[PDB]
Structures are given as structure tokens and as C-alpha cells.
Amino acid sequence: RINTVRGPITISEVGFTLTHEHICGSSAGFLRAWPEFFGSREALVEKAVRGLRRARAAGVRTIVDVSTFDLGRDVRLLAEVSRAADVHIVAATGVWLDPPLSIRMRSVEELTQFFLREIQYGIEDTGIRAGIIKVAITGKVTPFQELVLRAAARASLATGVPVITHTAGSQRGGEQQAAIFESEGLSPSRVCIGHSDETDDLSYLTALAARGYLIGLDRIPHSASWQTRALLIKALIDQGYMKQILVSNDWLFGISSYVTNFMDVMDSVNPDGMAFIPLRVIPFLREKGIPQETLAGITVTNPARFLSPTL
């Protein structure tokens, strides 16, 4: 079973899954301390519920909210929006690119215990348990980011929950992360190398897939061209790695961690929001001759295999 913000669900209930999404990209405590930044908490909820309902009408049944503590994850917001929209949401532990001092002063052992707390006991006082570990790194893995990756590997090994990563400021970087994960004994089948659609180096992606890594082609609408990114899905299929592909939008319904009103810029480029993958990418792949069964394998079978805790 897979833990969601409304409790455990069985694999058969997961359905069509977007594996790299957010409700809100923010900072810890910020939605509670300045909800007016987003108009109001009520306005953010209404926008997220409409957006998730739109995705649900296009076939989505589950999203993975990869927001960590330091990206302002508010699991009570996620639970409210999940219930209102009837879309499952998997919550995350881990560390993104803006850890406060109380996180970035910590050792690998301490970070391991924090991730384990959020997976095994629950997030804050809610009883909601994380179902994924998210780690972000920058170009050249910093000493702290290496501790995070090792703590994530150790928490995954103790719980079976998967790890999803990405590299900021670089079109590659999966090899750095893979070497650290493998040094810890982590299986590549527990790891998605995310934002992999930001490179055109197909031999780099094929080599990671051949080692058993999942390839996150999950920023498709952020080409602000999306068709070129989406053709990477067909190319990995043609190489025989359909089972290794995860697809998503990397979307959100509010954002405070960048410039003011960046949400408006994003919405203007991708008015489909979370429905961009099912409404645009899936029909595009079908028009290119990808069979429905292969598309269902990528959007349903692969995410369930990835998310199912597997020791």
C-alpha cells in the first residue's frame, strides 16, 4: 500500500499518476504567516481544487507533491485539496534547495532520522506519512547535498519508499547522484532522476535507464519547445526503456519562492496547468504512433511500481 494525505491506498487505486507536482511552492511556515501573499488561503485552495479537478477530468487520479519541508509543504492544505478534488496526493520528505539553518547544520545521521520520522511516524502532528523522498542538488553536489543524498538512500533502504531528485543549473548531473546512491547500496529502481527533459543528450539518458534508474521527463510545459521535450519520451520508448519513464508537469497553484506574480507568468505559458500532460502530451505521443497500452504503462504501471514501497 501507498501512503497518501488521506491515508493508505492500494496499488489498484493509484491510477493515472503525475509523479512530480506541487500544490504550492513556498517556504516553511510562510503560507501560515502571510497567506495574503497568495490573496488568501481560501483563494489558493479554490484555485488548487479547480486545477486538480481539471486534471482529474483529463484522467489523472493521483499526484505526487514533491514539496519538502523547506519548500513550504503544508500537508493540511494538501489533505483539504485532495478531499475536495477527489485526487489522491502523495506527500514528500527530503530537502530542496533552501534548507534553513536548523536543517543545513544537521549531520547525515540527523537528516536520516528526520526523513524516517516523516515516513514512519508522520508529518508534524497530522499522522500523514510521506510516500516519497525528494532531493534537489546544484551543478556540483555540495558537501551538504551529499549528506542529504546519503540520508535519503538510508531512509529509502529502511522503508522502501522511493527517491526522486533533480539537478538545478545543469542539463545533466544524474551520474553524480547515481554514484552516491550506489555507494550506499540503494537500488537504481528506487530512484527517479528528475527534470531529465532539460537535456537533449539521449545517450546520457539511455545509459542511466540501462542501469535501472527511472527517468523523470517531468518539466515538459516549462519550455517557455514542449514537443521536442516530449519526443524524448518516444526516443526512450524506441530504445526499449518504456518501463523506466515517468512523466509530469512540475506544476503548482501558488509560488512565493521566486519573484512576485511568477504564478501569473507560468499560467500564461501553460493555461492547461496539471492537465497539460494528459491533454497535450498524451495525444501528441499517440499521433506519433505510440500505442495506448504503452502510454498506459508509462502513466499508470510505472508510477505504481515506483511508489509501492519495495525493500
**Residues at the interface with its own copies (CB under 8 A):** 26-30, 32-34, 36-37, 69-70, 72, 98, 100-103, 105-107, 110, 113-114, 117-118, 123-125, 256-260
Which CB atom, from 132 or from 214, has the smaller least distance to its own copies?
Answer: 132
Rounded to 5 degrees, what are φ and ψ at 86? Answer: 55, 50
The minimum distance between CB 128 and its own copies, in angstroms, equals: 12
Mapped onto helix, strand or coil, the DSSP state of residue 72 is coil
The minimum distance between CB 82 and its own copies, in angstroms, equals: 20
Which CB atom, from 48 or from 103, has the smaller least distance to its own copies?
Answer: 103
Which CB atom, from 18 or from 152, has the smaller least distance to its own copies?
Answer: 152
Q: How many angstroms separate the CA atoms of 129 and 126, rounded?
A: 8
**And the C-alpha cell for 46?**
479554490
The closest of 230, 224, 217, 226 to 262, measured between CA atoms, is 224
The minimum distance between CB 91 and its own copies, in angstroms, equals: 12
Number of other residues whose CB lies within 10 A of the CB of residue 256: 18
CA dihedral of 271, 4, 282, 175, whole degrees rounded to 10: 100
Which CB atom, from 114 or from 251, has the smaller least distance to its own copies?
Answer: 114
- Scan for cell 517556504, then name that residue: 27
Q: How many angstroms separate the CA atoms of 71 and 139, rounded?
A: 19
CB 280, CB 272: distance < 8 Å: yes
Which CB atom, from 209 or from 263, has the smaller least distance to its own copies?
Answer: 263
Q: Is 222 annotated as a binding residue?
A: no
The minimum distance between CB 263 and its own copies, in angstroms, equals: 13
Which CB atom, from 101 or from 311, has the smaller least distance to its own copies?
Answer: 101
The minimum distance between CB 201 and its own copies, in angstroms, equals: 29
Which CB atom, from 33 or from 179, has the smaller least distance to its own copies?
Answer: 33
Rounded to 5 degrees, what are φ and ψ at 216? Answer: -85, 100
Q: Is 250 annotated as a binding residue?
A: yes
The minimum distance between CB 56 and its own copies, in angstroms, equals: 29
Helical segments of the chain, H only: 11-14, 30-33, 41-57, 75-85, 101-104, 108-116, 143-159, 174-183, 202-210, 226-238, 262-269, 276, 282-287, 292-296, 302-307
Q: Is 231 exposed, middle or buried (0-12, 13-18, 19+ CB in 10 A)?
A: middle
The minimum distance between CB 71 and its own copies, in angstroms, equals: 9
Q: Is 22 annotated as a binding residue?
A: yes
Annotated binding site: 20, 22, 134, 166, 195, 250
Annotated binding site for Zn(2+): 20, 22, 134, 166, 195, 250
